[PDB]
Design a protein around this motif. Structure first.
Motif, PDB file in Angstrom:
ATOM      1  N   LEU A  50       0.813  -1.218  -0.168  1.00  0.00           N
ATOM      2  CA  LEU A  50      -0.051  -0.057   0.017  1.00  0.00           C
ATOM      3  C   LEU A  50       0.751   1.376   0.123  1.00  0.00           C
ATOM      4  O   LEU A  50       1.970   1.048   0.346  1.00  0.00           O
TER       5      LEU A  50
ATOM      6  N   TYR B  14      -2.765   3.528   3.649  1.00  0.00           N
ATOM      7  CA  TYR B  14      -2.454   2.951   4.760  1.00  0.00           C
ATOM      8  C   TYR B  14      -3.048   3.579   5.967  1.00  0.00           C
ATOM      9  O   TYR B  14      -4.027   3.385   6.843  1.00  0.00           O
TER      10      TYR B  14
ATOM     11  N   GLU C  82      -6.769   4.319   5.756  1.00  0.00           N
ATOM     12  CA  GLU C  82      -7.502   2.982   5.750  1.00  0.00           C
ATOM     13  C   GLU C  82      -8.680   2.919   6.441  1.00  0.00           C
ATOM     14  O   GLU C  82      -9.844   2.474   5.679  1.00  0.00           O
TER      15      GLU C  82
ATOM     16  N   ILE D 222       5.099   3.458   6.570  1.00  0.00           N
ATOM     17  CA  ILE D 222       3.755   2.593   6.964  1.00  0.00           C
ATOM     18  C   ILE D 222       4.338   1.619   8.072  1.00  0.00           C
ATOM     19  O   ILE D 222       3.730   1.322   9.142  1.00  0.00           O
TER      20      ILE D 222
ATOM     21  N   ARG E 219      -3.650   7.585  11.119  1.00  0.00           N
ATOM     22  CA  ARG E 219      -3.753   6.059  11.104  1.00  0.00           C
ATOM     23  C   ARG E 219      -4.877   5.658  11.940  1.00  0.00           C
ATOM     24  O   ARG E 219      -5.757   5.087  11.592  1.00  0.00           O
TER      25      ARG E 219
END
Length: 523
Positions: free
Chosen positions: A17, A22, A25, A198, A241
């Motif tokens: 990704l 990410y 997401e 990530i 995130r």
């Protein structure tokens, strides 16, 4: 060898990704919640607002000619625009490099020229610093008012996202280009990849037992500068995130932070030591509602825990080249555990740590001082346009040699003992060996080199260099010294050259400078 790891188990980390995908997401789980909070004017951006604006910015970037692979230099204080420009560039497959808004025109120009920056995004007031550089192809864009012929950020936020370019990004592609410290010589462009970041974010906030237990119900403070990789990563990316709103302060009035914390219900407060000591000694603590405070991120430890019993104190250890988070304590994990004082935490999960003997390059066991080495997907891919420097910092087996001395006790806790040990102490000056070794090996009759400090009566230590000249070469010590002499300031100069067959190296490839230093202890 003796390999050490996180006290936590590994976790799943996507390897297919782009960073933006990410980080956003789980956008859907908090689409309408606050994402970016501008502390200066109270503006609030919802997650949905940020995701949409990001794609639009990717389109605008293409509209004005910025393409995949192109570098975009951010010259802004921490702010919403910084975050939108970042996500936009990521979506476009471009690279972003940032610098402190307060830098001098000259360093700004050096930063921009070195990174091959095609676009520079800043505020009007800073246009004055960058006009001399742009005059000598790079486009200048301002976020507030567009003086003279500068572009305006709205050209990116108001662009039509339908025409954002279809782009295929490789996880190995670079997204961030923060510049290293000048500890090893000249600041170098650190290529952090999509996959790399990530991984770093995952290591911190993912898993059923995340090392850092953030969530959308938290409010993260952002008073540290976003141009520094630590905030950009540990605050911005991690905040995203997780779906947590981020309280952004372009500039903050120390002394009234307790007010901010109360008003916005800050739960996570990453702050520098001075600001931390202050709020801790404030006689008005019990007059504010700090009930929301959960974590405070870095003697003063004892008082902090005493003044904020409802919150926990967490500790970390990072290095730009490392991604940059190397270690963290477990004080704020969903399943928390305590760390002994002095320790800086434990190696991040999904990685390996090793302590190596400086003169032999062998792996040391617990409780034994050595150079800290780490391996894992979070470390940089390398130094921009400098493979030679890269291959001499990250060995062929993937270990990043941090340059710091430390040890790991029986509790798997990491203790840092000495930083910048490689430095040569010359008359109050600190000379970096790597800087000199690069110039040295650049010589056509030199294939390898290693510089170390030789004790001197006056200077304390003088930079010396072991050189492996090519067979047939007849170059003398004086010519080598003059060669280096005309390329650096007087105190960085090599005062002695010692030709030898080969530079001592560990099976890894790590040149053993410490070994050569000991070899000359006699002289």
């Amino acid at each position: 060898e003796f390999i050490f790891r996180s006290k936590l188990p590994d976790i799943y980390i996507p390897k297919n990704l782009p960073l933006h995908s990410y980080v956003l997401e789980n956008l859907s789980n908090h689409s309408s919640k606050p994402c970016l909070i501008n502390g200066a004017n109270g503006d609030v951006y919802t997650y949905a607002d940020v995701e949409l604006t990001a794609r639009r910015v990717a389109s605008g970037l293409n509209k004005i000619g910025i393409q995949q692979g192109d570098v975009i230099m951010l010259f802004l204080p921490s702010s919403p625009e910084f975050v939108l420009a970042f996500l936009g560039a990521s979506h476009r497959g471009a690279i972003i490099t940032a610098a402190n808004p307060f830098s001098t025109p000259a360093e700004l120009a050096k930063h921009a020229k070195a990174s091959r920056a095609k676009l520079l995004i800043t505020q009007a007031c800073y246009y004055e610093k960058v006009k001399d550089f742009a005059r000598e192809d790079v486009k200048v864009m301002c976020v507030d008012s567009a003086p003279d012929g500068c572009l305006h950020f709205s050209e990116l936020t108001q662009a039509d996202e339908n025409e954002a370019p279809q782009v295929d990004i490789s996880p190995d592609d670079v997204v961030a280009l923060p510049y290293s410290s000048g500890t090893t010589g000249l600041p170098k462009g650190v290529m952090l990849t999509h996959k790399g970041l990530i991984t770093s974010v995952a290591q911190q906030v993912d898993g059923d037992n995340p090392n850092l237990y953030f969530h959308s119900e938290d409010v993260i403070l952002c008073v540290l500068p976003m141009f520094h990789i630590y905030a950009l990563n540990s605050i911005m990316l991690c905040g995203l995130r997780v779906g947590a709103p981020i309280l952004i302060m372009p500039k903050f009035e120390i002394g009234s932070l307790l007010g901010l914390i109360e008003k916005y219900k800050v739960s996570i407060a990453p702050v520098v030591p001075p600001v931390m000591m202050s709020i801790a000694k404030s006689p008005d603590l019990d007059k504010h509602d700090l009930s929301s405070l959960r974590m405070i991120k870095s003697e003063l430890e004892d008082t902090v825990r005493a003044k904020f019993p409802q919150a926990r104190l967490g500790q970390g250890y990072g290095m730009t080249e490392a991604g940059p988070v190397l270690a963290m304590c477990l004080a704020f994990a969903k399943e928390p555990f305590d760390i002994k004082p002095g320790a800086c935490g434990t190696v991040v999960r999904n990685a390996e740590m090793k302590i190596v003997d400086p003169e032999t390059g062998a792996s040391l066991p617990r409780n034994q001082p050595g150079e800290i080495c780490i391996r894992g997907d979070q470390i940089m891919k390398g130094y921009l346009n400098d493979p030679e420097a890269t291959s001499r910092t990250i060995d062929k087996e993937g270990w990043l040699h941090t340059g710091d001395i430390g040890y790991i006790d029986d509790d798997d806790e990491l203790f840092i003992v000495d930083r910048l040990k490689e430095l040569i102490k010359y008359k109050g000056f600190q000379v970096a060996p790597a800087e000199l070794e690069a110039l040295l090996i650049a010589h056509p009759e030199i294939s390898d080199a290693a510089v170390v400090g030789l004790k001197d009566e006056d200077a304390g230590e003088v930079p010396v260099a072991f050189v492996v000249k090519s067979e047939k070469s007849q170059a003398t010590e004086d010519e080598i010294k003059q060669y280096i002499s005309k390329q650096v300031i007087f105190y960085k100069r090599i005062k002695r050259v010692f030709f030898i067959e080969a530079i001592p190296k560990a099976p890894s490839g790590k040149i053993l400078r410490k070994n050569l230093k000991e070899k000359l202890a006699g002289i």
